Design an enzyme around this catalytic site. Structure first.
Site, PDB file in Angstrom:
ATOM      1  CB  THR A 183      -0.909  -0.017   1.226  1.00 21.33           C
ATOM      2  OG1 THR A 183      -1.581  -1.269   1.234  1.00 21.33           O
ATOM      3  CG2 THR A 183      -1.977   1.066   1.168  1.00 21.33           C
TER       4      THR A 183
HETATM    5  C1  LIG Z   1       0.564  -2.530   0.915  1.00 20.85           C
HETATM    6  C2  LIG Z   1       0.729  -3.839   0.084  1.00 20.85           C
HETATM    7  C3  LIG Z   1       1.752  -2.556   1.920  1.00 20.85           C
HETATM    8  O1  LIG Z   1       1.361  -1.920   3.147  1.00 20.85           O
HETATM    9  C4  LIG Z   1      -0.884  -2.448   1.704  1.00 20.85           C
HETATM   10  O2  LIG Z   1      -0.671  -2.325   3.108  1.00 20.85           O
HETATM   11  C5  LIG Z   1      -1.952  -3.550   1.475  1.00 20.85           C
HETATM   12  C6  LIG Z   1      -3.188  -3.085   2.257  1.00 20.85           C
HETATM   13  C7  LIG Z   1      -4.422  -3.637   1.833  1.00 20.85           C
HETATM   14  C8  LIG Z   1      -4.595  -4.562   0.796  1.00 20.85           C
HETATM   15  C9  LIG Z   1      -5.862  -5.043   0.468  1.00 20.85           C
HETATM   16  C10 LIG Z   1      -6.983  -4.612   1.165  1.00 20.85           C
HETATM   17  C11 LIG Z   1      -6.829  -3.692   2.197  1.00 20.85           C
HETATM   18  C12 LIG Z   1      -5.562  -3.214   2.525  1.00 20.85           C
HETATM   19  N1  LIG Z   1      -1.565  -4.864   2.012  1.00 20.85           N
HETATM   20  C13 LIG Z   1      -1.657  -6.007   1.300  1.00 20.85           C
HETATM   21  O3  LIG Z   1      -2.007  -6.089   0.123  1.00 20.85           O
HETATM   22  C14 LIG Z   1      -1.251  -7.259   2.059  1.00 20.85           C
HETATM   23  C15 LIG Z   1       0.256  -7.358   2.077  1.00 20.85           C
HETATM   24  C16 LIG Z   1       0.588  -7.693   3.395  1.00 20.85           C
HETATM   25  C17 LIG Z   1       0.357  -8.993   3.835  1.00 20.85           C
HETATM   26  C18 LIG Z   1       0.671  -9.368   5.133  1.00 20.85           C
HETATM   27  C19 LIG Z   1       1.222  -8.445   6.026  1.00 20.85           C
HETATM   28  O4  LIG Z   1       1.561  -8.757   7.318  1.00 20.85           O
HETATM   29  C20 LIG Z   1       0.936  -9.871   7.986  1.00 20.85           C
HETATM   30  C21 LIG Z   1       1.458  -7.142   5.582  1.00 20.85           C
HETATM   31  C22 LIG Z   1       1.143  -6.762   4.276  1.00 20.85           C
HETATM   32  N2  LIG Z   1      -1.790  -8.453   1.377  1.00 20.85           N
HETATM   33  C23 LIG Z   1      -2.525  -9.384   2.018  1.00 20.85           C
HETATM   34  O5  LIG Z   1      -2.818  -9.329   3.213  1.00 20.85           O
HETATM   35  C24 LIG Z   1      -2.969 -10.584   1.166  1.00 20.85           C
HETATM   36  C25 LIG Z   1      -4.471 -10.494   0.856  1.00 20.85           C
HETATM   37  N3  LIG Z   1      -2.679 -11.825   1.912  1.00 20.85           N
HETATM   38  C26 LIG Z   1      -1.455 -12.396   1.916  1.00 20.85           C
HETATM   39  O6  LIG Z   1      -0.485 -11.956   1.300  1.00 20.85           O
HETATM   40  C27 LIG Z   1      -1.319 -13.684   2.754  1.00 20.85           C
HETATM   41  N4  LIG Z   1      -0.449 -13.342   3.884  1.00 20.85           N
HETATM   42  C28 LIG Z   1      -1.223 -13.548   5.126  1.00 20.85           C
HETATM   43  C29 LIG Z   1      -0.435 -13.189   6.335  1.00 20.85           C
HETATM   44  O7  LIG Z   1       0.754 -14.017   6.295  1.00 20.85           O
HETATM   45  C30 LIG Z   1       1.558 -13.786   5.111  1.00 20.85           C
HETATM   46  C31 LIG Z   1       0.780 -14.176   3.891  1.00 20.85           C
END
Ligand SMILES: *[C@@](C)(CO)[C@](*)(O)[C@H](Cc1ccccc1)NC(=O)[C@H](Cc1ccc(OC)cc1)NC(=O)[C@H](C)NC(=O)CN1CCOCC1
Ligand SMILES: *[C@@](C)(CO)[C@](*)(O)[C@H](Cc1ccccc1)NC(=O)[C@H](Cc1ccc(OC)cc1)NC(=O)[C@H](C)NC(=O)CN1CCOCC1
Ligand SMILES: *[C@@](C)(CO)[C@](*)(O)[C@H](Cc1ccccc1)NC(=O)[C@H](Cc1ccc(OC)cc1)NC(=O)[C@H](C)NC(=O)CN1CCOCC1
Ligand SMILES: *[C@@](C)(CO)[C@](*)(O)[C@H](Cc1ccccc1)NC(=O)[C@H](Cc1ccc(OC)cc1)NC(=O)[C@H](C)NC(=O)CN1CCOCC1
Ligand SMILES: [Mg+2]
Ligand SMILES: [Mg+2]
Ligand SMILES: [Mg+2]
Ligand SMILES: [Mg+2]
EC number: 3.4.25.1
Lengths: 196, 233, 204, 222, 195, 212, 222, 196, 195
Positions: free
Chosen positions: A1
């Site tokens: 993000t």
């Molecule tokens: C950007 C990528 C970096 O801060 C944003 O924060 C973004 C925010 C967002 C995205 C979609 C809807 C609402 C808000 N974050 C992501 O896209 C996020 C990346 C991320 C994953 C895990 C984190 O720490 C636990 C931090 C950032 N993506 C996800 O959550 C996706 C949907 N899921 C995964 O990647 C699976 N993860 C689960 C937690 O363990 C690691 C694998």
């Protein structure tokens, strides 16, 4: 993000990109990171999608219940509820949330809630992975009491740069305008913002 | 033992009736930072071979120096350097494959995935892959990184087996490649919009196109998506 | 320390023409040490047959547990449980232990007493149903069993032919596995007779 | 797995391949990954096979009880909310990755759910090991205002990309169409492009080939 | 602990259990009885983790004795073995499991038959003609495969047992200080004093 | 593997199984674990297959060179010590070998040397080596006498490998028998356990643990 | 940390007749869940009527094949164009493999040809060089699926003569080239169904005193 | 560190802060991170002080020896020598070096050499821990063929922001001007640049 | 390996060394001589890592025998012990050290005195009246502190040794299969056959 919220003369504007990543794969390129917790209180979500989503859903529940008993909550109240969840569950959450809302007394307010669960009231706020690249820009270009059109440009240019350098950010720029007039959703496509 | 620092993402390629096409974006990533934006990852060798390189850029630049030096060495005491004894794609490839496998065998790899695309002196199309492990393979379509997961499926709808190659024109083939590059820009978080493309044809020779862009992108449907489930505003 | 391959064992089941077959080996060992050459892995509750591979203490426990449940089922329903129903009961019971599971590979086999249809099914240790027309395999020599069954099997075999097929599948798979063998049992199951044959196999 | 969901004019379609795996081995060559939550809400599952089955039945059960309680047809957002809150509670330890689609009094809907409990919205979606092969097809051919027949074609094309190019996917294509006003049609084995060729030989043995030690009649009766 | 054997013959069950109790580099005792009488016609030998072994044996013993008093009746070896297995099967998924392997030797008075049950700490039960726990089995099972016959007398069973103990004293690395032998038949449980 | 070799009145018996394992996968049932170094010298193999194969074939080349240079057949002691000194050079590298060097010379008589990959070298009358050594020891030790006839000794060796083939999950296939006298080694055939087990069970009345 | 090894999948199969021998192998090359090539040959004619395949990690396999081909070449130079017998090739390969005992070629190797009496021969190696001549051997990913089928159908294991009370075994006999090729094709179609790394194409090399012939067959591409 | 080099009309300018850290302690607040490898070829050093120092000393030796035999080296040559050291010893070094020099034929040139040992010729370059915060700013404010005074302002403003956000950067801003005129050292104190 | 003892009395040095050689759960041999004669009036017992022990003993043996031939003279026990210590002191900082502990028992013909040297694998040397390596010492040193006298005869030394072996067989966990005893005096080295 990449996410941000900016106060101005008529209220406040929230901005965000639309990229969701699982590693280097883009799970969703048209994500809506701007979420409503009340009529005129919204938040931008960074960090874990699952954690920020579950938090936002709980906050929406609390403010709906607050509203039924005590009337419309202040933006500060909304931020306090976010904090209470983020702070007390700091070991189990990865959520960086920006809260923004419009009162008629207090006008536009912005509260940022980083990983620790602390609260910080500010004129504007930036957060997410891509925000690192625009600290210099935003500090140099932010003025207080901007117009709506000036503020839209500030956010559009800022997020354009964040998107340009951060691989974890991209897609469209979504914005949400919070004023006495009402709630306006805006969207800006790559072809426009890329060549700013 | 290394870890790659400045990296290049997918390299995609395919055969068609008279030649081969290869493409690769112009980005040099530094983790999640899109640090450098003028990086050429297609390197031609003579006028009958293009080597496309992904992975660590410092190691790519090293490989550039080797190939450039190879041309020089081949010309030495060689009156037929621009004729019968010119460098073939198969010669260039086997040399790289040799180097890659020796480096992995000394536990000091060149952290790359390489595709050598070209046309042999007898008119036959050459397309073969090699990587940091020294693993080699050939196919009518080849791709590295995300390219393997997203490009290959699309390119294989055009050329699914050997017998589909004479049936495939350069117009059809280039269209599939340019479409694949768009899909990768949608879905690869370490890709860029700007890319280079190269055709090696047995009649028209080497055409090297720079400064291409992904166009005709569908984004309009985004304005209809709200929240993540129950949101209406 | 991999529970699924301490004791060893295999189970295989096939369908034929108006019949089913289910077979198992007899080995119970403690890794390299063979301990028992009489340890059967197939049980039945009425006309429904259950074979269980994996950790022997769980094999025993689950048998005792399904006997328990099918007995109460029968008392309240006033009828024997059917293979489709029992398969669901196994799935429920295994998934109930989702985060502390039994280390087993069950296989259900039987003929529905109403419709006369032959029915086989298999599960992972956590309850996922694997229904199949042709065959189900389980145990330490499952790779081998998959290979034997996939080449040897054909549809609509008569009970006496199906016996030779399932037996040959089990035998030759067990001979390529260190933890399986030491004897074998084959159940041939028809609508209202069940033949049980002990096979002669190499004892190493 | 490879699973997809595609929205069209008057509804939504979901599709899936039919391969199940245990490591590199194909455990099941024709399993159904399309689950019914309610008559007009169907769910495609990837990840841990038992978790997708168990979580889909549990929510389907509670959705039925809810539908009876409220005297109303169930909504997709209810299944979404219940699934996501359940999965979140278990912090990803229930490895269910789902595409949820269906029609209800509110309209037609398409969502995805990840194991940690995050949800997305889309006009087209894909999950599983073959999601990238499928998504490439969806990104290449999807457009606004798809007809029913165009959407089925696109969905099955996306699943085919998975079948051919992903080793974690194979065999057949299942489809479910959920259109507004109509019953959902579950098209089991809509395509079967992986039929085993005739074997060169029959391996039916001579009777008596297998050496036997003992025989006995088993008593199943009382 | 370490060495516990069992042989079922025609009319009896013979249990042999090592006498040594060791901790560190000191043999603390050379006359330890690694067995408890569960009932007049049922005997259990045990081997495993220190402390657990006795605590488990005595806990099982109390339970079986309680049953005997309540019903004024002796439980069959099969029933006792099933009870013991279930307790070990519970234990293995407890916070701290009993790490004890046992052999249950009994004479069933209703069938007039000897019975030998081998049960490990996981709750894995088997009825056998001859059994062993620990490294012992690696020598004795093969020896008994060769020399054991089903119709042997109690005296022939003891000679077969001496043959096992001789082999173990020859090839085992540790000094286990010989064995205590006990016989279980229709007339109850008795100990052989000179072995 | 189970391998053994023992000394007695009438020379040396050597018996080995024939299974090769890759974990729980049965790799082969028809493997040669005895190498005929020369007409008077035998080597048994247990542990890593190629480690044993490669270095015992190499041992044969070294023994051959000794008799070319010294016009005399190498002693069992010297042949065993070439192998033990070799593996000692590789100590720590991860070789895995459990070998027995058996043979006759006039100056030594019948002689057996146990050599392993830790560098241990032992002369002795009886050894069993490999994953099934304990099972073989159990039968052999309880039936061994010095005064066994060649016929009985041959059988005892065969029966001891059979015992281990049965109980040890990592032993089996078939028994390979050898007898070594003053006149050299004599091969006494391959004996598949598939048939041998049932033949022994019936004739001997043993293996009552099994369902006959 | 850099992992110098990888798994390129595939499977290979060697059967020996009376006056011939076959070495078969699928033409699929993979890494993880991706297909790299549907036709990448891994069974090679090495000269002197010896065919060779080194399945597992392709880079190590190609390296080995390349070195053995080179070994044959120098054998001719150094020993007056003498023919390298199959037994001599096997021993030479043992030394190649063992030369890297402490950094192995991750390959299961099979060679096929004719012995010095004109009879069919199959030799097989582990990754570090231990070898054995057999009538029959499968190698690679699906070896565990195919090998017990070959034990049963080539060496007639567990097959007794009908009505002999399981006392008389089915007698061993050589198979015709027609029968062997049936078993190869059925072995590979079976392996393809149940193993994800096996598919695309089958390539067989047949070796007689007249030379080396090739045969190719399509396999399922999912 | 925050460091940068910028080409302009008359040549090139190198800029750098003056902060050296050992953890959160400032070992030296008046450090000179701009080092001469030849008359008009200089470099900015980021990463390990020991590694960048030893590299720079070796490069200076090589160019002094080059000069004695073949005359004045090109800026490209200097960068190639830096690369050769950084690339071949990539496992043992933590050095991010920017090279800048003035030829009379080639005018001002800038080459950046990040951790991998790769070379990248650019109009301007930024590096060090504090550079993350000014990507957005520098991309928006850089023009080609700036004047000397414009370029000095660009660097001064840029490094001011990097210093403001990066704790690992601070103290004075040093600059070095490379033109046909000669070599000019500049310095700018906190009181001036902080309140820009 | 494991058990090696040494007792120096009035006119001789007595070395006692266990006969067992074990690997895994199998006693491979029960008649092993853990000693090498370095010279007619010098004997070295050894214990430690498998393979290393013999390789080291025989390497030392060859060196001392080479010296004897070159100088036509026997090296003093003190000189041999110093040579052996230096080799072990080198070894401990090598790529792969010899993990061998030794006892050197010798009769010095120039002084007419018995000498016992205890040397561990690190190259730590001490001259003692009585010595032991391994866990043995934990029992024998205290026993000998009590029962040993400096003016004892060879026969009294053997009785004192039996007292050590008896205690070890009683309290040691492992079966070490008895000992081979050797005496070193003015008339050379001889082995006691019945112990
Ligand atoms: C950007 C990528 C970096 O801060 C944003 O924060 C973004 C925010 C967002 C995205 C979609 C809807 C609402 C808000 N974050 C992501 O896209 C996020 C990346 C991320 C994953 C895990 C984190 O720490 C636990 C931090 C950032 N993506 C996800 O959550 C996706 C949907 N899921 C995964 O990647 C699976 N993860 C689960 C937690 O363990 C690691 C694998
Ligand atoms: C494709 C085939 C993935 O390769 C799909 O995601 C598929 C989904 C599916 C859904 C319903 C019915 C059948 C198939 N997933 C699987 O088939 C799944 C693959 C998988 C196994 C284990 C995992 O965690 C390590 C993750 C994914 N296979 C299974 O669930 C099989 C039936 N079960 C097991 O292998 C047992 N595992 C489950 C997880 O816990 C350890 C034991
Ligand atoms: C029995 C069967 C127990 O394995 C024997 O020890 C047997 C002896 C033997 C002798 C000659 C020819 C074949 C077999 N040993 C094996 O079959 C052996 C078991 C073993 C494997 C690996 C070891 O590592 C130290 C030790 C023992 N099996 C093999 O050698 C198999 C055929 N090959 C491999 O496992 C290949 N490995 C070897 C080690 O390096 C990695 C690859
Ligand atoms: C900023 C801090 C971040 O990039 C600059 O790069 C700056 C560059 C500099 C400083 C002085 C002179 C010339 C150039 N770097 C430092 O000040 C540096 C911080 C640093 C240390 C180690 C690194 O990786 C190995 C990376 C950055 N400070 C030092 O080198 C000081 C003098 N020494 C230490 O902190 C001791 N280090 C030695 C290496 O091991 C860790 C402890
Ligand atoms: Mg971006
Ligand atoms: Mg077996
Ligand atoms: Mg066995
Ligand atoms: Mg397949």
């Amino acid at each position: 993000t990449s996410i941000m919220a900016v106060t101005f003369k008529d209220g406040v504007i929230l901005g965000a990109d639309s990229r969701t990543t699982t590693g280097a794969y883009i799970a969703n390129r048209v994500t809506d990171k701007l979420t409503r917790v009340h009529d005129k209180i919204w938040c931008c979500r960074s960090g874990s999608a699952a954690d920020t989503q579950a938090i936002a859903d709980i906050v929406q529940y609390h403010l709906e219940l607050y509203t039924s008993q005590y009337g419309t909550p202040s933006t500060e109240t909304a931020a306090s509820v976010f904090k209470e969840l983020c702070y007390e569950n700091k070991d189990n959450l990865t959520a960086g949330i920006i809260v923004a809302g419009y009162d008629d007394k207090n006008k536009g307010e912005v509260y940022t809630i980083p990983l620790g669960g602390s609260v910080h009231k500010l004129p504007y706020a930036i957060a997410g992975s891509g925000s690192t690249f625009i600290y210099g820009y935003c500090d140099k270009n932010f003025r207080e009491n901007m117009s709506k059109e000036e503020t839209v440009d500030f956010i559009k240019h800022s997020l354009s740069q964040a998107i340009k350098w951060d691989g974890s950010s991209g897609g469209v720029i979504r914005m949400v305008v919070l004023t006495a007039a009402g709630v306006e959703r805006l969207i800006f496509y790559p072809d426009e913002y890329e060549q700013l | 033992t290394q870890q790659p620092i400045v990296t290049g993402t997918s390299v995609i390629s395919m055969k068609y009736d008279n030649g081969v096409i290869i493409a690769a974006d112009n980005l040099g990533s530094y983790g999640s930072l899109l640090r450098f934006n003028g990086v050429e990852r297609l390197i031609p060798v003579g006028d009958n071979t293009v080597v496309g390189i992904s992975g660590d850029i410092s190691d790519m630049q090293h490989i550039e120096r080797l190939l450039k030096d190879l041309v020089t060495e081949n010309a030495y005491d060689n009156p037929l350097a621009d004729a019968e004894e010119a460098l073939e794609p198969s010669y260039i490839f086997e040399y790289l494959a040799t180097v890659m496998y020796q480096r992995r065998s000394k536990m000091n790899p060149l952290w790359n995935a390489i595709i050598v695309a070209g046309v042999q002196s007898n008119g036959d199309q050459f397309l073969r892959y090699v990587n940091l492990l020294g693993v080699t393979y050939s196919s009518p379509t080849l791709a590295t990184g995300f390219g393997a997961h997203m490009a290959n499926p699309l390119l294989r709808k055009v050329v699914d087996r050997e017998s589909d190659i004479p049936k495939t024109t350069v117009q059809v083939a280039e269209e599939a490649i340019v479409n694949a590059m768009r899909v990768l820009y949608y879905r690869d978080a370490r890709s860029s919009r700007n890319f280079s493309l190269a055709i090696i044809d047995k009649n028209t020779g080497l055409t090297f196109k720079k400064n291409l862009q992904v166009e005709n992108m569908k984004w309009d449907f985004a304005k209809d998506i709200k929240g993540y489930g129950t949101q209406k505003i | 320390s991999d529970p699924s391959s301490i004791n060893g064992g295999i189970v295989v089941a096939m369908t034929g023409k108006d019949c089913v077959a289910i077979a198992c080996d007899l080995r119970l060992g403690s890794q390299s040490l063979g301990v028992s050459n009489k340890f059967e892995k197939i049980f039945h509750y009425g006309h429904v047959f259950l074979g269980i591979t994996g950790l022997a203490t769980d094999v025993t426990t689950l048998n005792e547990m399904f006997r328990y449940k099918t007995n109460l089922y029968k008392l309240k329903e006033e009828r024997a449980i059917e293979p489709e129903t029992f398969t669901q009961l196994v799935s429920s019971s295994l998934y109930e232990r989702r985060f502390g599971p039994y280390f087993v590979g069950p296989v259900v086999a039987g003929i529905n007493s109403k419709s006369g249809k032959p029915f086989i099914a298999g599960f992972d240790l956590i309850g996922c149903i694997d229904e199949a027309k042709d065959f189900i395999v389980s145990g330490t020599a499952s790779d081998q069993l998959f290979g034997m069954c996939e080449s040897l099997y054909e549809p609509n075999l008569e009970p006496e032919d199906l016996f030779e097929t399932i037996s040959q599948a089990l035998l030759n798979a067990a001979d390529r596995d260190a933890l399986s063998g030491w004897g074998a049992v084959v159940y041939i199951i028809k609508k209202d007779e069940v033949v049980k044959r002990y096979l002669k196999m190499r004892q190493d | 797995t490879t699973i997809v969901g595609v929205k069209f004019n008057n509804g939504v379609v979901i599709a899936a391949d039919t391969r199940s795996t245990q490591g590199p081995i194909v455990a099941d060559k024709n399993c159904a990954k399309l689950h019914r939550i309610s008559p007009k809400i169907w769910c495609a599952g990837a990840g841990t096979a038992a978790d997708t089955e168990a979580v889909t039945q549990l929510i389907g059960s509670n959705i039925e009880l809810h539908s009876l309680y409220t005297s109303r047809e169930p909504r997709v957002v209810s299944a979404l909310q219940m699934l996501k809150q359940h999965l979140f509670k278990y912090q990803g330890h229930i490895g269910a990755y789902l595409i949820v689609a269906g029609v209800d009094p509110t309209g037609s809907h398409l969502f995805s759910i990840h194991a940690h409990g995050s949800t997305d919205v889309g006009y087209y979606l894909s999950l599983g090991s073959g999601s990238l092969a499928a998504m490439a097809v969806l990104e290449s051919h999807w457009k606004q205002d798809l007809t029913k027949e165009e959407a089925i074609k696109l969905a099955s094309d996306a699943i085919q990309a998975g079948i051919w190019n992903d080793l974690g996917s194979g065999s057949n294509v299942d489809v479910c169409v959920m259109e507004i006003g109509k019953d959902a049609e579950y098209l089991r084995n809509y395509l079967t492009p992986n039929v085993r060729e005739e074997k060169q030989k029959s391996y039916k043995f001579p009777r008596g080939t297998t050496a036997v030690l003992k025989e006995s009649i088993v008593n199943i009766c009382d | 602990m370490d060495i516990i054997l069992g042989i079922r013959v025609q009319d009896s069950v013979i249990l042999a259990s090592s006498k040594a109790v060791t901790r560190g580099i000191s043999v603390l005792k050379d006359s330890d009885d690694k067995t408890r009488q569960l009932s007049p016609h049922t005997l259990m030998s045990f081997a495993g983790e220190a402390g657990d072994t006795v605590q488990f044996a005595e806990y099982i013993q109390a339970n079986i004795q309680l049953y005997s008093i309540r019903e004024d009746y002796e439980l069959s070896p099969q029933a006792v073995s099933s009870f013991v297995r279930q307790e070990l099967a519970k234990s293995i998924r407890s916070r701290r499991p009993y790490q004890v392997n046992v052999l249950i030797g009994g004479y069933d008075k209703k069938k007039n038959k000897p019975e030998l049950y081998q049960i490990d700490y996981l709750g894995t039960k088997v009825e056998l003609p001859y059994g062993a726990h620990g490294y012992s089995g690696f020598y004795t099972f093969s020896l008994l495969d060769h020399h054991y016959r089903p119709d042997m007398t109690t005296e022939e069973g003891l000679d077969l047992l001496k043959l096992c103990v001789q082999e173990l004293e020859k090839r085992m690395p540790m000094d286990f200080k010989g064995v205590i032998v006990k016989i279980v038949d229709k007339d109850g449980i008795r100990q052989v004093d000179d072995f | 593997t189970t391998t053994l070799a023992f000394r007695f009145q009438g020379g040396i018996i050597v018996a080995v199984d024939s299974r090769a394992t890759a974990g729980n996968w049965v790799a082969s049932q028809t493997v040669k674990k005895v190498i005929e170094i020369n007409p008077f010298l035998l080597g048994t193999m247990a542990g890593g297959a190629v480690d044993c194969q490669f270095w015992e074939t190499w041992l044969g080349s070294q023994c051959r060179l000794h008799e070319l240079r010294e016009k005399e057949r190498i002693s069992v002691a010297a042949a065993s010590k070439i192998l033990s000194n070799l593996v000692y050079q590789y100590k720590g590298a991860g070789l895995s070998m459990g070998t027995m060097i058996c043979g006759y010379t006039r100056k030594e008589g019948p002689t057996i040397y146990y050599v392993d990959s830790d560098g241990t070298r032992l002369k002795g009358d009886i050894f069993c080596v490999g994953s099934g050594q304990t099972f073989a020891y159990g039968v052999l030790d309880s039936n061994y006498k010095w005064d066994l006839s060649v016929e009985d000794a041959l059988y005892l060796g065969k029966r001891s490998i059979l015992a281990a083939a049965h109980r040890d999950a990592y032993s089996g296939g078939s028994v390979n028998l050898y007898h070594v006298t003053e006149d050299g080694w004599i091969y006494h055939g391959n004996h598949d356990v598939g048939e041998l087990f049932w033949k022994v069970k019936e004739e001997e009345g043993s293996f009552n643990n099994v369902i006959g | 940390q850099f992992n110098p090894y990888g798994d390129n999948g595939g499977t290979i199969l060697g059967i020996a007749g009376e006056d011939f021998a076959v070495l078969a192998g699928d033409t699929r090359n993979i890494t993880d869940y991706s297909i790299n090539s549907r036709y990448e040959p891994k069974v090679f004619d090495c000269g002197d009527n010896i065919v060779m395949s080194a399945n597992g990690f392709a880079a190590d396999g190609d390296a080995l094949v390349k070195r053995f081909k080179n070994s044959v070449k120098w054998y001719h130079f150094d020993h007056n164009d003498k023919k390298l017998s199959i037994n001599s090739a096997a021993r030479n390969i043992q030394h190649l493999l063992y030369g890297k005992r402490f950094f192995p070629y991750y390959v299961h190797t099979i060679i096929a040809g004719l012995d010095e009496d004109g009879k069919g021969a199959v030799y097989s190696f582990d990754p570090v060089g231990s070898y054995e001549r057999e009538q029959c051997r499968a190698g690679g990913a699906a070896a565990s699926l195919i090998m017990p089928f070959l034990d049963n159908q080539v060496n007639f294991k567990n097959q007794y003569e009908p009505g002999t009370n399981g006392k008389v075994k089915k007698p061993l006999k050589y198979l015709s080239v027609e029968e062997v090729i049936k078993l190869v094709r059925d072995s590979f179609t079976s392996a393809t169904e149940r193993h994800i790394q096996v598919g695309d194409g089958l390539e067989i090399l047949i070796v007689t005193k007249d030379g080396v012939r090739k045969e190719f067959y399509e396999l399922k591409r999912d």
